[PDB]
Structure 1
Amino acid sequence: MIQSQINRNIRLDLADAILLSKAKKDLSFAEIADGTGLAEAFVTAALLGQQALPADAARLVGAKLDLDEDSILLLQMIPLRGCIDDRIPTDPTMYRFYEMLQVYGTTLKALVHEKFGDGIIAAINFKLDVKKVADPEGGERAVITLDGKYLPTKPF
């Protein structure tokens, strides 16, 4: 039977536990997700309390990280999502994504309405991935793809 959380601190504390075990075992997120049949961003997000793992994947990551049974169960619960401590990130890495909203939020709105119509790009119907590639002017770049579904707002 599906089970859900209502207080984020339970799964966020579990996340800190997972991170220590991961560091102690010198593991990557890529290798923890290996063998789950699930994308690295989905599995990572679960570990960090923002998604629920199916039972088989919870058991597999739990074995990797030497987690107890209550931890393995908790990873299968539907989370109380929200990873930002207090609404606006303080961490520079996370902040940049917030800054994108500050600079391009209204442009994204305007061009979503022009290209798709009145409604939204779903934050629920998703796939997410992060790639590193060379920058042609030197150095490296991130190409992060958010693959969402347009959901129209229509009169009733």
Structure 2
Amino acid sequence: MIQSQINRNIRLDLADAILLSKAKKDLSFAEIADGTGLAEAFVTAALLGQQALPADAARLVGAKLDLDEDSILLLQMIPLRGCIDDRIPTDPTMYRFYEMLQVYGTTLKALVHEKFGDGIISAINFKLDVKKVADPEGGERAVITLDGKYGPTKPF
């Protein structure tokens, strides 16, 4: 039977324990996700309390991190999502993505409406990936792809 959470702190506290174990074993997120059949971004989000893992995935990652049974079960719960402590991130790495919204948010709105119509780009029927690409002028770039279904707003 599906199970769900109502207070994010239980899974965020689990996330912290996970991260300590991960550090102690010197694991990467890529290796934790290996063997689950699920994308790195998805599995990582689950560990960090933002997604639910299927039972087999939860058992796999649970073994890798030496998690107790309650933790493995907690990983299967539908989370109370929301990773940002207090609405606006303080962390520079997280903050840049918020800044992308402060600069381009209305442009995204305008261009969504022009290209698709009234409605939204989904954050649920949605996937994300992060790719590293050499910058021709020197150094490295992140190409982050947000891929969401268009959901139209129609009269009724």
Residue by residue over 1:88-142, the C-alpha shift from the partner in whole angstroms, topping out at 9 and shown as x without a partner, is 0000000000000000000000000000000000000011110111001110000
Matches of 1:47 and 1:9, distance apart in 2: 13
Mind listing any 5+ residue stretches in structure 2 that lack a counterpart?
Answer: none
Residue by residue over 1:4-58, the C-alpha shift from the partner in whole angstroms, topping out at 9 and shown as x without a partner, is 0000000000000000000000000000000000000000000000000000000
Residue by residue over 1:50-96, the C-alpha shift from the partner in whole angstroms, topping out at 9 and shown as x without a partner, is 00000000000000000000000000000000000000000000000
Determine helix, strand or coil for the equivalent of 1:15: helix
Matches of 2:28 and 2:141, distance apart in 1: 20
- Percentage identity across aligned positions? 99
In structure 2, the residue matched to 1:52 is 52
TM-score (norm 2): 1.00
Structure 1's consecutive aligned runs of 4 or more residues displaced over 2 angstroms after TM superposition are none
Determine helix, strand or coil for the equivalent of 1:76: coil
Matches of 1:126 and 1:115, distance apart in 2: 18
TM-score (norm 1): 1.00
Matches of 1:122 and 1:3, distance apart in 2: 24
Post-superposition shift, 1:146? 1.1
Matched, 1:138 2:138: yes
Matches of 1:128 and 1:94, distance apart in 2: 15
Mind listing any 5+ residue stretches in structure 1 that lack a counterpart?
Answer: none
Determine helix, strand or coil for the equivalent of 1:123: strand
In structure 2, the residue matched to 1:84 is 84
Matches of 1:74 and 1:56, distance apart in 2: 13
Matches of 2:22 and 2:46, distance apart in 1: 14
Determine helix, strand or coil for the equivalent of 2:88: coil
Determine helix, strand or coil for the equivalent of 1:132: strand
